[PDB]
Design an enzyme around this catalytic site. Structure first.
Site, mmCIF file in Angstrom:
data_model
loop_
_atom_site.group_PDB
_atom_site.id
_atom_site.type_symbol
_atom_site.label_atom_id
_atom_site.label_comp_id
_atom_site.label_asym_id
_atom_site.label_seq_id
_atom_site.Cartn_x
_atom_site.Cartn_y
_atom_site.Cartn_z
ATOM 1 N N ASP A 195 -0.974 0.314 2.010
ATOM 2 C CA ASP A 195 -1.710 1.397 1.369
ATOM 3 C C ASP A 195 -2.428 2.285 2.404
ATOM 4 O OD1 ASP A 195 -4.335 -0.014 1.912
ATOM 5 O OD2 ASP A 195 -3.798 -1.298 0.215
ATOM 6 N N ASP A 197 -6.250 4.112 2.705
ATOM 7 C CA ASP A 197 -7.616 4.077 2.201
ATOM 8 C C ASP A 197 -8.431 5.165 2.816
ATOM 9 O OD1 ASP A 197 -6.758 1.627 0.969
ATOM 10 O OD2 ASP A 197 -7.613 0.429 2.623
ATOM 11 N N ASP A 280 -6.217 4.268 -1.972
ATOM 12 C CA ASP A 280 -7.536 3.912 -2.479
ATOM 13 C C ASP A 280 -8.547 4.909 -1.979
ATOM 14 O OD1 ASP A 280 -6.352 1.525 -3.583
ATOM 15 O OD2 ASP A 280 -6.837 0.428 -1.737
HETATM 16 O O1 LIG Z 1 -6.402 -8.478 9.073
HETATM 17 C C1 LIG Z 1 -6.465 -8.603 7.847
HETATM 18 C C2 LIG Z 1 -6.980 -9.895 7.214
HETATM 19 C C3 LIG Z 1 -7.472 -11.055 8.140
HETATM 20 O O2 LIG Z 1 -8.343 -10.608 9.145
HETATM 21 C C4 LIG Z 1 -7.521 -12.580 7.630
HETATM 22 O O3 LIG Z 1 -7.157 -12.880 6.483
HETATM 23 O O4 LIG Z 1 -7.910 -13.578 8.332
HETATM 24 C C5 LIG Z 1 -6.045 -7.484 6.892
HETATM 25 C C6 LIG Z 1 -7.271 -6.631 6.472
HETATM 26 C C7 LIG Z 1 -7.178 -5.349 6.093
HETATM 27 C C8 LIG Z 1 -6.195 -4.625 5.474
HETATM 28 C C9 LIG Z 1 -6.703 -3.351 5.235
HETATM 29 C C10 LIG Z 1 -6.191 -2.279 4.450
HETATM 30 O O5 LIG Z 1 -6.456 -2.172 3.257
HETATM 31 C C11 LIG Z 1 -5.442 -1.214 4.992
HETATM 32 C C12 LIG Z 1 -4.219 -1.479 5.702
HETATM 33 C C13 LIG Z 1 -3.429 -0.433 6.277
HETATM 34 C C14 LIG Z 1 -3.910 0.911 6.141
HETATM 35 C C15 LIG Z 1 -5.114 1.288 5.465
HETATM 36 F F1 LIG Z 1 -5.560 2.641 5.374
HETATM 37 C C16 LIG Z 1 -5.856 0.180 4.891
HETATM 38 C C17 LIG Z 1 -7.876 -3.295 5.882
HETATM 39 N N1 LIG Z 1 -8.199 -4.524 6.309
#
Ligand SMILES: O=C(/C=C(\O)C(=O)O)/C=C/c1cc(C(=O)c2cccc(F)c2)c[nH]1
Length: 356
Positions: A195, A197, A280
């Site tokens: 996604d 955001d 989002d």
């Molecule tokens: O790294 C992890 C989880 C661990 O650290 C663990 O479970 O230990 C994923 C977290 C994560 C995903 C996103 C998004 O929503 C997102 C992704 C791509 C583009 C965008 F704009 C937003 C933000 N933080």
């Protein structure tokens, strides 16, 4: 000395230990699916600390002095060093329950409970779920199945930038002074994402203007034939409530599916000429923009350790809306992420260094 906290580590996208962390991430995901929260946390912390290493583990001696590596985790690392594979993660990948839960939750609108229900009904494929004449699907699931192929293909940076343009053009139509910031994985330097955001804030908008923007922007896209799905969650955040010790407390946000025309995408590279994209949008009060930006930038593990460090090491309470000092009995103000880090007594970690 490597800290046990991700917020005191620099974790960049050059992961030298993918062989270990891919296996640990699979084992953590299985423990989440088996509702084993404790074992899930232990694997997540071990994966996180190895992601921060500036070199690859090639012997058990290389794990000396690394925190968050318990006996169970060290047995898994030892097995991967032995023959380049994890027998434990390989058995999870071949497990019928794990395969079904990954496949079913890959659908937008399908969570743990619905995936478990379908599995216990004897379903194993998405084709059999979609064509069943007895099953009832939520509006979210209907959209998840209708746009499945587009939603399961990775969003790339040219597509995220094309979405940013759409968001900024729509937002400035109703609030010209609004600041729109791409958050999540893309802000951390990721090439792909599931996604896109955005955080939206306005220095001069009223409480009512701030509340109506997401409704105005989505109605505009609906008129434009670009809104494929929309769910707006009204704000639950309170100006003078202490930060949580909770996903029930949040800023006004919306979960969308947008129609992204290929003409809008400026890439180096056929079909229907458009792609469904999960978007989002988050709206926050101007004075809380640094807390919201910090919370929405992630990663999930970086956020967890930030809040844990604030509580256990500083006797502070951190949330997406505020930072409260329990000793001084005062809320701490911040105009930037740098000021939040300084209030916590932490060296500033750049967004591309928060990939814990
Ligand atoms: O790294 C992890 C989880 C661990 O650290 C663990 O479970 O230990 C994923 C977290 C994560 C995903 C996103 C998004 O929503 C997102 C992704 C791509 C583009 C965008 F704009 C937003 C933000 N933080």
């Amino acid at each position: 000395k490597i800290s046990q906290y991700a917020c005191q580590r620099r974790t960049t996208l050059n992961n030298y230990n993918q062989l270990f962390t891919d296996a640990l991430d699979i084992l953590a995901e299985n423990d989440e699916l088996r509702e084993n929260e404790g074992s899930c946390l232990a694997f997540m912390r071990a994966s996180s600390v190895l992601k921060s290493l500036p070199f690859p583990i090639t012997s058990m001696k290389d794990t000396e002095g690394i925190p968050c590596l318990g006996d169970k985790v060290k047995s898994i690392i030892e097995g991967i060093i032995e023959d380049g594979e994890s027998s434990e993660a390989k058995a999870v990948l071949n497990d019928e329950r794990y395969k079904s839960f990954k496949l079913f939750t890959s659908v937008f609108g399908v969570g743990l409970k619905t995936a478990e229900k379908w599995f216990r009904m004897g379903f194993r494929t998405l084709s059999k779920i979609q064509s069943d004449k007895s099953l009832r699907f939520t509006q979210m699931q209907k959209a998840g199945f209708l746009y499945y192929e587009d939603l399961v293909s990775c969003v790339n940076r040219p597509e995220a930038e094309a979405v940013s343009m759409l968001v900024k053009e729509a937002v400035v139509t109703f609030l010209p002074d609004a600041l729109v910031t791409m958050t999540g994985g893309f802000r951390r330097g990721k090439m792909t994402g599931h996604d896109v955001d955005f955080l939206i804030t306005s220095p001069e908008a009223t409480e009512d203007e701030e509340q109506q923007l997401l409704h105005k922007v989505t109605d505009f896209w609906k008129q434009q034939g670009l809104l494929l799905y929309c769910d707006i969650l009204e704000s639950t955040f309170e100006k003078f409530k202490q930060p949580s010790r909770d996903a029930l407390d949040h800023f006004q946000k919306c979960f969308l599916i947008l129609k992204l025309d290929h003409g809008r995408v400026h890439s180096e590279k056929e079909g229907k000429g458009w792609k469904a994209i999960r978007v989002d949008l988050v709206m926050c009060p101007y004075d809380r923009r640094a807390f919201a930006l910090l919370g929405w930038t992630g990663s999930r593990q970086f956020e967890r350790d930030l809040r844990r460090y604030a509580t256990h090491e500083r006797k502070m309470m951190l949330d997406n809306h505020a930072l409260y000092d329990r000793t001084k009995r005062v809320f701490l103000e911040a105009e930037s992420e740098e000021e939040i880090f300084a209030h916590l007594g932490l060296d500033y970690i750049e967004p591309w260094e928060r990939n814990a």
